RNA sequence: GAGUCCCAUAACCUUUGUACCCCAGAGUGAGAAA
RNA sequence: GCGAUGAUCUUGACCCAUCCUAUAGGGGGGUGGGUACAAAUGGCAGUCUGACAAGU
């Protein structure tokens, strides 16, 4: 998909799959495209991971629009089943938002990976 | 509720029981983005210095800002068609703004506002080939820039020496992070002012507009051929 | 001693800048780029303007944003090509396609700056506001359609289409009741027996 | 402008004041919105019509943003028809369900 | 000798004057997608819709005779048809706008012949009222009273109106 | 899991404008003008 | 050269003027307030929850 614009690679995709694993471990992420847009609407989500594998990709790429309108980071990993196993349900997951509280036990790596996303915009 | 004029006719202060900044209307009826209309009869549109970037530069102010109500304005700019409405509201029907954006995700809303506002000329090629949009423009009297993709100075340099006239004026919102993160504000800003005066645009003023948005200054410059 | 090509509103404007084929390219700002001075230097020669139609606008858009292959551009090319004179070319990407023709094509950016600043005063004779109106018309007409997809599947019309549905149903119910009352004054029975509006 | 919407909103894009008042008093929300007048949720019978209202909202969001943000789609309704067959066999396999015993 | 024609005749024509104003405004905002410039130059509803039925697509280009027959201002509209260009096309199904504008034309031409009908009907039913106060105020009076006999049996002080 | 159809096509209120009138009002009943 | 075929009739608050005591107040210049209608990217006004279900 040439229209899946920010797509990761091995190091940063491994880091974001690790941090989404720890976020699902303490259970403060949201799983699903419309739930990701709900979090984008109510401003809760720290950033968005999406899957540059969905058929067609326009089921997913609407939330980039309001995501950059609300200036949130948003990344593509190249496999929906990979980040589904990352988020810890048994289903192919198309998008996942990661919420925010400041008492979080993964706060510093969340901030590190979101600066890593913003380094490629 | 009383209207105060700035140095530039087109930017006013609606102050009174609430105090804020407004512009004129080149289109009556309604706020095209969802702000309040001050009524005096005469209508006045708020524009938020957060959701705009030139508006907070008016909250910075200038000895001579090159937007005047006869001064033809070019707007390379960010792709959103938000602030070009108020550049139109400043310039009135005698001047004209040419807004040039490439990514057509706000190109459609730009076309939508510019249909009901004949003050705006929408150019929908890239911001890097004025040789390609020659025939839709002639000898603009000012340029404004809000491009974030990192060859800001070189590409507004090419636009400013192709279309902006002699002894005209440039006004740029120079970003820090969108060209160079990890290096500080005044460093990358003085680097940009260095390459501008290398391109013989005489700089006049930079200021960071801090509480409205973080670490993006505006620089302004006289042009010298 | 030169002719220059510049596309202005829908056209190819050959402007005659009476100076040398090399010195007008060379000095070009010590040539006193003033209104009367460059107006007397760059005099009006030709303006191959096709029409104000959108098809001529499409020919102009293909000649501008891509290399010059317009038939109107060829017709303007067969209007001063008899001496291999200095025909100042405008675009830099449509320069090899300009050179692919039997002509003598040629800071020239600055003479185009001067030509552009003294075009709407006198050089076609046309109006400042009319040139800006034709330019904004061109931009709203065919620049957005040649970059973007279309506007044939535009969706803003369907809102007033369905508003016409709802208001036509409401208004037609009121007309039905008024006709049933008026002809019921001649026939008070049949509105009970055929309640259908259009059958009434 | 409705392509950038969650499918929950497209489940409830008509029953606005009923939804908001059933929030306001601590009461129970509606389940249809405007979508109740669709043929599939008409064909469903019970509260599984609310369930198929949810799944039709989801597949409508899918098909809706497909033909909204597509740039070259075939004007044919292919994945719309595919999702229609999906919700149709979903509907039959939930109308096979009956909570009363046999 | 029957005012039951006249009361619902006037209560019919004021309502249809309202909705032909509504439908002419809808024709205006629909044809703004084809002529966003014509709406300020030709403001009149009936002549507007009658020339919208005339010029379908922006292809006038040659004459002024038929445009003035629908009407100089014609010539300005003719030039602005090629200079405006803030306009879409939608020509393959603009024929519904062509049928709709002539539908407003047929409605507004049913009006004024209904108005001629009740001018005759107030000249025949209440001729003293039509001669003294006019047909419009006469029909409004007997409607606002309820009927002719009720208006008559009203006393002279309760002929108050708004 | 989860109250649409009480009409969000909305209902009310405000603002904009528009042709408007600014008097008692099951109006009072015999005076005005010199 | 009047009128039961209808005479008459109590006006929401004040800024320079025409009148009564070189400049200052009280009795046809200036004006608020409200009544019968169309529009709003005006306000009320906020766009449900999110992994289990079913059968053997």
Short mmCIF file of N, CA, C and O in Angstrom, two decimals, chain E residues 52-142:
data_model
loop_
_atom_site.label_atom_id
_atom_site.label_comp_id
_atom_site.label_asym_id
_atom_site.label_seq_id
_atom_site.Cartn_x
_atom_site.Cartn_y
_atom_site.Cartn_z
N UNK E 52 -33.08 29.83 -16.15
CA UNK E 52 -32.43 28.57 -15.80
C UNK E 52 -32.98 27.44 -16.65
O UNK E 52 -32.24 26.55 -17.09
N UNK E 53 -34.28 27.49 -16.96
CA UNK E 53 -34.82 26.57 -17.95
C UNK E 53 -34.26 26.83 -19.34
O UNK E 53 -34.15 25.90 -20.14
N UNK E 54 -33.80 28.06 -19.62
CA UNK E 54 -33.26 28.35 -20.94
C UNK E 54 -31.82 27.86 -21.08
O UNK E 54 -31.53 26.98 -21.89
N UNK E 55 -30.90 28.43 -20.30
CA UNK E 55 -29.49 28.08 -20.44
C UNK E 55 -29.21 26.89 -19.52
O UNK E 55 -29.22 27.01 -18.29
N UNK E 56 -29.00 25.73 -20.12
CA UNK E 56 -28.74 24.54 -19.32
C UNK E 56 -27.27 24.49 -18.93
O UNK E 56 -26.92 24.61 -17.74
N UNK E 57 -26.38 24.37 -19.91
CA UNK E 57 -24.95 24.40 -19.66
C UNK E 57 -24.40 25.73 -20.15
O UNK E 57 -25.03 26.44 -20.93
N UNK E 58 -23.18 26.04 -19.70
CA UNK E 58 -22.51 27.30 -20.01
C UNK E 58 -22.02 27.26 -21.45
O UNK E 58 -20.84 27.06 -21.74
N UNK E 59 -22.96 27.45 -22.38
CA UNK E 59 -22.68 27.38 -23.80
C UNK E 59 -23.47 28.41 -24.59
O UNK E 59 -23.85 28.17 -25.74
N UNK E 60 -23.78 29.55 -23.97
CA UNK E 60 -24.51 30.62 -24.65
C UNK E 60 -23.69 31.22 -25.79
O UNK E 60 -24.03 31.06 -26.97
N UNK E 61 -22.64 31.97 -25.44
CA UNK E 61 -21.45 32.22 -26.23
C UNK E 61 -21.63 33.11 -27.47
O UNK E 61 -20.64 33.67 -27.96
N UNK E 62 -22.85 33.31 -27.95
CA UNK E 62 -22.91 33.99 -29.24
C UNK E 62 -23.91 35.13 -29.31
O UNK E 62 -23.62 36.16 -29.93
N UNK E 63 -25.07 34.97 -28.71
CA UNK E 63 -26.18 35.90 -28.92
C UNK E 63 -26.40 36.75 -27.68
O UNK E 63 -25.85 36.49 -26.62
N UNK E 64 -27.21 37.79 -27.86
CA UNK E 64 -27.78 38.54 -26.76
C UNK E 64 -29.28 38.67 -26.89
O UNK E 64 -29.94 39.13 -25.94
N UNK E 65 -29.85 38.25 -28.02
CA UNK E 65 -31.25 38.50 -28.33
C UNK E 65 -32.17 37.72 -27.40
O UNK E 65 -33.04 38.30 -26.75
N UNK E 66 -31.98 36.40 -27.32
CA UNK E 66 -32.83 35.58 -26.47
C UNK E 66 -32.58 35.85 -24.99
O UNK E 66 -33.50 35.73 -24.17
N UNK E 67 -31.37 36.26 -24.65
CA UNK E 67 -31.07 36.59 -23.27
C UNK E 67 -31.76 37.89 -22.85
O UNK E 67 -32.26 38.00 -21.73
N UNK E 68 -31.83 38.88 -23.75
CA UNK E 68 -32.60 40.07 -23.43
C UNK E 68 -34.10 39.81 -23.51
O UNK E 68 -34.88 40.49 -22.83
N UNK E 69 -34.51 38.84 -24.32
CA UNK E 69 -35.92 38.45 -24.36
C UNK E 69 -36.34 37.77 -23.08
O UNK E 69 -37.50 37.83 -22.67
N UNK E 70 -35.40 37.08 -22.43
CA UNK E 70 -35.65 36.59 -21.08
C UNK E 70 -35.53 37.71 -20.06
O UNK E 70 -36.16 37.64 -18.99
N UNK E 71 -34.74 38.73 -20.36
CA UNK E 71 -34.64 39.89 -19.48
C UNK E 71 -35.91 40.73 -19.56
O UNK E 71 -36.11 41.65 -18.76
N UNK E 72 -27.98 43.91 -21.99
CA UNK E 72 -26.91 44.57 -21.26
C UNK E 72 -26.51 43.81 -20.02
O UNK E 72 -25.38 43.34 -19.89
N UNK E 73 -27.46 43.72 -19.08
CA UNK E 73 -27.33 42.79 -17.96
C UNK E 73 -27.22 41.37 -18.48
O UNK E 73 -26.48 40.53 -17.94
N UNK E 74 -27.97 41.08 -19.55
CA UNK E 74 -27.81 39.85 -20.32
C UNK E 74 -26.37 39.67 -20.78
O UNK E 74 -25.78 38.61 -20.59
N UNK E 75 -25.77 40.73 -21.33
CA UNK E 75 -24.39 40.65 -21.81
C UNK E 75 -23.40 40.45 -20.68
O UNK E 75 -22.41 39.72 -20.84
N UNK E 76 -23.66 41.05 -19.52
CA UNK E 76 -22.79 40.84 -18.37
C UNK E 76 -22.88 39.40 -17.87
O UNK E 76 -21.87 38.81 -17.48
N UNK E 77 -24.09 38.83 -17.89
CA UNK E 77 -24.24 37.43 -17.51
C UNK E 77 -23.56 36.52 -18.53
O UNK E 77 -22.93 35.52 -18.18
N UNK E 78 -23.59 36.92 -19.81
CA UNK E 78 -22.95 36.15 -20.87
C UNK E 78 -21.44 36.14 -20.70
O UNK E 78 -20.78 35.10 -20.84
N UNK E 79 -20.86 37.30 -20.36
CA UNK E 79 -19.43 37.34 -20.09
C UNK E 79 -19.08 36.61 -18.80
O UNK E 79 -18.05 35.93 -18.72
N UNK E 80 -19.93 36.73 -17.78
CA UNK E 80 -19.64 36.09 -16.51
C UNK E 80 -19.85 34.59 -16.55
O UNK E 80 -19.37 33.89 -15.66
N UNK E 81 -20.54 34.09 -17.57
CA UNK E 81 -20.62 32.65 -17.78
C UNK E 81 -19.27 32.05 -18.15
O UNK E 81 -19.05 30.86 -17.89
N UNK E 82 -18.38 32.83 -18.74
CA UNK E 82 -17.05 32.36 -19.09
C UNK E 82 -15.95 32.95 -18.23
O UNK E 82 -14.81 32.49 -18.31
N UNK E 83 -16.24 33.99 -17.45
CA UNK E 83 -15.25 34.54 -16.54
C UNK E 83 -15.46 34.10 -15.10
O UNK E 83 -14.51 34.18 -14.30
N UNK E 84 -16.66 33.64 -14.73
CA UNK E 84 -16.97 33.27 -13.35
C UNK E 84 -16.17 32.05 -12.93
O UNK E 84 -15.25 32.17 -12.11
N UNK E 85 -16.49 30.91 -13.53
CA UNK E 85 -15.76 29.64 -13.45
C UNK E 85 -15.45 29.21 -12.01
O UNK E 85 -14.44 28.56 -11.75
N UNK E 86 -16.31 29.55 -11.06
CA UNK E 86 -16.21 29.03 -9.73
C UNK E 86 -17.24 27.93 -9.59
O UNK E 86 -17.92 27.82 -8.57
N UNK E 87 -17.35 27.12 -10.64
CA UNK E 87 -18.55 26.35 -10.88
C UNK E 87 -18.21 24.92 -11.28
O UNK E 87 -17.25 24.67 -12.01
N UNK E 88 -19.02 24.00 -10.79
CA UNK E 88 -18.94 22.60 -11.16
C UNK E 88 -19.70 22.42 -12.47
O UNK E 88 -20.07 23.39 -13.14
N UNK E 89 -19.96 21.17 -12.87
CA UNK E 89 -20.73 20.96 -14.09
C UNK E 89 -22.02 20.23 -13.75
O UNK E 89 -23.11 20.81 -13.85
N UNK E 90 -21.89 18.98 -13.29
CA UNK E 90 -22.99 18.06 -12.94
C UNK E 90 -24.06 17.99 -14.03
O UNK E 90 -25.26 17.90 -13.75
N UNK E 91 -23.62 18.01 -15.29
CA UNK E 91 -24.55 18.20 -16.40
C UNK E 91 -25.37 16.94 -16.69
O UNK E 91 -26.48 17.03 -17.22
N UNK E 92 -24.85 15.77 -16.32
CA UNK E 92 -25.51 14.53 -16.70
C UNK E 92 -26.79 14.31 -15.90
O UNK E 92 -27.65 13.52 -16.30
N UNK E 93 -26.94 15.00 -14.78
CA UNK E 93 -28.18 14.97 -14.02
C UNK E 93 -28.49 16.35 -13.46
O UNK E 93 -28.85 16.51 -12.29
N UNK E 94 -28.30 17.36 -14.29
CA UNK E 94 -28.83 18.70 -14.09
C UNK E 94 -30.21 18.85 -14.70
O UNK E 94 -30.88 19.86 -14.48
N UNK E 95 -30.66 17.83 -15.44
CA UNK E 95 -31.99 17.85 -16.02
C UNK E 95 -33.08 17.82 -14.97
O UNK E 95 -34.18 18.31 -15.23
N UNK E 96 -32.80 17.29 -13.78
CA UNK E 96 -33.76 17.40 -12.69
C UNK E 96 -33.88 18.83 -12.19
O UNK E 96 -34.97 19.25 -11.82
N UNK E 97 -32.79 19.59 -12.22
CA UNK E 97 -32.90 21.01 -11.92
C UNK E 97 -33.65 21.73 -13.04
O UNK E 97 -34.43 22.66 -12.77
N UNK E 98 -33.49 21.28 -14.28
CA UNK E 98 -34.25 21.87 -15.38
C UNK E 98 -35.75 21.60 -15.26
O UNK E 98 -36.57 22.46 -15.59
N UNK E 99 -36.12 20.40 -14.80
CA UNK E 99 -37.53 20.11 -14.60
C UNK E 99 -38.05 20.83 -13.35
O UNK E 99 -39.18 21.32 -13.32
N UNK E 100 -37.19 20.97 -12.35
CA UNK E 100 -37.61 21.57 -11.09
C UNK E 100 -37.85 23.06 -11.22
O UNK E 100 -38.81 23.60 -10.64
N UNK E 101 -37.01 23.76 -11.99
CA UNK E 101 -37.21 25.19 -12.17
C UNK E 101 -38.47 25.47 -12.98
O UNK E 101 -39.20 26.42 -12.68
N UNK E 102 -38.77 24.63 -13.96
CA UNK E 102 -40.02 24.84 -14.67
C UNK E 102 -41.21 24.37 -13.85
O UNK E 102 -42.34 24.80 -14.10
N UNK E 103 -40.98 23.52 -12.85
CA UNK E 103 -42.06 23.19 -11.92
C UNK E 103 -42.42 24.38 -11.06
O UNK E 103 -43.60 24.67 -10.84
N UNK E 104 -41.40 25.10 -10.58
CA UNK E 104 -41.63 26.37 -9.90
C UNK E 104 -42.28 27.38 -10.84
O UNK E 104 -43.12 28.19 -10.42
N UNK E 105 -41.94 27.32 -12.13
CA UNK E 105 -42.57 28.20 -13.10
C UNK E 105 -44.05 27.90 -13.27
O UNK E 105 -44.88 28.81 -13.32
N UNK E 106 -44.41 26.61 -13.31
CA UNK E 106 -45.82 26.24 -13.44
C UNK E 106 -46.60 26.58 -12.18
O UNK E 106 -47.76 26.98 -12.26
N UNK E 107 -45.96 26.47 -11.01
CA UNK E 107 -46.64 26.84 -9.77
C UNK E 107 -46.87 28.34 -9.69
O UNK E 107 -47.98 28.80 -9.37
N UNK E 108 -45.85 29.13 -10.00
CA UNK E 108 -46.00 30.58 -9.99
C UNK E 108 -46.89 31.08 -11.12
O UNK E 108 -47.33 32.23 -11.06
N UNK E 109 -47.14 30.27 -12.15
CA UNK E 109 -48.12 30.68 -13.14
C UNK E 109 -49.52 30.18 -12.83
O UNK E 109 -50.49 30.73 -13.36
N UNK E 110 -49.66 29.16 -11.98
CA UNK E 110 -50.96 28.87 -11.38
C UNK E 110 -51.36 29.99 -10.44
O UNK E 110 -52.54 30.36 -10.35
N UNK E 111 -50.39 30.51 -9.70
CA UNK E 111 -50.57 31.80 -9.06
C UNK E 111 -50.68 32.87 -10.13
O UNK E 111 -50.23 32.70 -11.26
N UNK E 112 -51.35 33.96 -9.76
CA UNK E 112 -51.80 35.12 -10.53
C UNK E 112 -52.97 34.78 -11.44
O UNK E 112 -53.82 35.63 -11.67
N UNK E 113 -53.18 33.51 -11.76
CA UNK E 113 -54.45 33.19 -12.38
C UNK E 113 -55.45 32.73 -11.34
O UNK E 113 -56.64 33.03 -11.47
N UNK E 114 -54.98 32.11 -10.26
CA UNK E 114 -55.83 32.00 -9.08
C UNK E 114 -56.14 33.37 -8.50
O UNK E 114 -57.25 33.62 -8.02
N UNK E 115 -55.17 34.27 -8.54
CA UNK E 115 -55.38 35.62 -8.03
C UNK E 115 -56.36 36.38 -8.90
O UNK E 115 -57.20 37.12 -8.39
N UNK E 116 -56.30 36.19 -10.22
CA UNK E 116 -57.31 36.75 -11.11
C UNK E 116 -58.68 36.15 -10.84
O UNK E 116 -59.70 36.86 -10.89
N UNK E 117 -58.72 34.85 -10.53
CA UNK E 117 -59.98 34.19 -10.21
C UNK E 117 -60.62 34.79 -8.97
O UNK E 117 -61.82 35.08 -8.96
N UNK E 118 -59.85 34.98 -7.90
CA UNK E 118 -60.50 35.52 -6.72
C UNK E 118 -60.69 37.03 -6.80
O UNK E 118 -61.51 37.55 -6.05
N UNK E 119 -59.96 37.74 -7.66
CA UNK E 119 -60.35 39.12 -7.93
C UNK E 119 -61.73 39.17 -8.57
O UNK E 119 -62.57 39.98 -8.18
N UNK E 120 -61.99 38.26 -9.50
CA UNK E 120 -63.35 38.16 -10.04
C UNK E 120 -64.34 37.68 -8.98
O UNK E 120 -65.49 38.13 -8.96
N UNK E 121 -63.91 36.80 -8.09
CA UNK E 121 -64.85 36.24 -7.13
C UNK E 121 -65.20 37.23 -6.04
O UNK E 121 -66.32 37.22 -5.53
N UNK E 122 -64.26 38.09 -5.66
CA UNK E 122 -64.61 39.18 -4.77
C UNK E 122 -65.32 40.30 -5.50
O UNK E 122 -66.02 41.09 -4.86
N UNK E 123 -65.16 40.41 -6.81
CA UNK E 123 -65.99 41.35 -7.54
C UNK E 123 -67.41 40.84 -7.73
O UNK E 123 -68.29 41.62 -8.08
N UNK E 124 -67.64 39.55 -7.51
CA UNK E 124 -68.97 38.98 -7.68
C UNK E 124 -69.67 38.70 -6.36
O UNK E 124 -70.88 38.93 -6.24
N UNK E 125 -68.93 38.33 -5.32
CA UNK E 125 -69.54 37.91 -4.07
C UNK E 125 -69.70 39.11 -3.15
O UNK E 125 -70.80 39.41 -2.71
N UNK E 126 -68.60 39.82 -2.88
CA UNK E 126 -68.61 40.99 -2.01
C UNK E 126 -68.11 42.19 -2.80
O UNK E 126 -66.97 42.64 -2.61
N UNK E 127 -68.93 42.73 -3.70
CA UNK E 127 -68.45 43.81 -4.56
C UNK E 127 -68.25 45.11 -3.83
O UNK E 127 -67.35 45.87 -4.19
N UNK E 128 -69.03 45.36 -2.78
CA UNK E 128 -68.83 46.57 -2.00
C UNK E 128 -67.54 46.50 -1.21
O UNK E 128 -66.82 47.50 -1.11
N UNK E 129 -67.21 45.32 -0.69
CA UNK E 129 -65.93 45.14 -0.02
C UNK E 129 -64.77 45.26 -1.00
O UNK E 129 -63.73 45.83 -0.66
N UNK E 130 -64.94 44.73 -2.21
CA UNK E 130 -63.84 44.80 -3.17
C UNK E 130 -63.61 46.22 -3.64
O UNK E 130 -62.47 46.64 -3.86
N UNK E 131 -64.69 46.98 -3.80
CA UNK E 131 -64.55 48.37 -4.22
C UNK E 131 -64.06 49.26 -3.10
O UNK E 131 -63.33 50.22 -3.36
N UNK E 132 -64.45 48.99 -1.86
CA UNK E 132 -64.05 49.86 -0.78
C UNK E 132 -62.63 49.57 -0.33
O UNK E 132 -61.79 50.47 -0.26
N UNK E 133 -62.33 48.30 -0.04
CA UNK E 133 -61.08 47.95 0.62
C UNK E 133 -60.13 47.16 -0.28
O UNK E 133 -58.94 47.05 0.05
N UNK E 134 -60.60 46.65 -1.41
CA UNK E 134 -59.73 45.87 -2.26
C UNK E 134 -59.91 44.38 -2.04
O UNK E 134 -60.41 43.93 -1.01
N UNK E 135 -59.48 43.61 -3.03
CA UNK E 135 -59.72 42.17 -3.00
C UNK E 135 -58.85 41.48 -1.96
O UNK E 135 -59.32 40.55 -1.29
N UNK E 136 -57.61 41.93 -1.81
CA UNK E 136 -56.71 41.27 -0.87
C UNK E 136 -57.17 41.48 0.56
O UNK E 136 -57.30 40.52 1.33
N UNK E 137 -57.51 42.71 0.92
CA UNK E 137 -57.95 42.99 2.28
C UNK E 137 -59.35 42.43 2.50
O UNK E 137 -59.69 42.02 3.61
N UNK E 138 -60.16 42.35 1.44
CA UNK E 138 -61.48 41.76 1.58
C UNK E 138 -61.44 40.28 1.87
O UNK E 138 -62.12 39.79 2.78
N UNK E 139 -60.62 39.54 1.12
CA UNK E 139 -60.49 38.11 1.37
C UNK E 139 -59.81 37.85 2.70
O UNK E 139 -60.22 36.93 3.43
N UNK E 140 -58.80 38.65 3.06
CA UNK E 140 -58.20 38.52 4.37
C UNK E 140 -59.19 38.81 5.48
O UNK E 140 -59.16 38.15 6.52
N UNK E 141 -60.10 39.76 5.26
CA UNK E 141 -61.10 40.07 6.27
C UNK E 141 -62.08 38.94 6.46
O UNK E 141 -62.36 38.55 7.60
N UNK E 142 -62.61 38.38 5.38
CA UNK E 142 -63.63 37.36 5.59
C UNK E 142 -62.99 36.05 6.03
O UNK E 142 -63.63 35.26 6.74
#
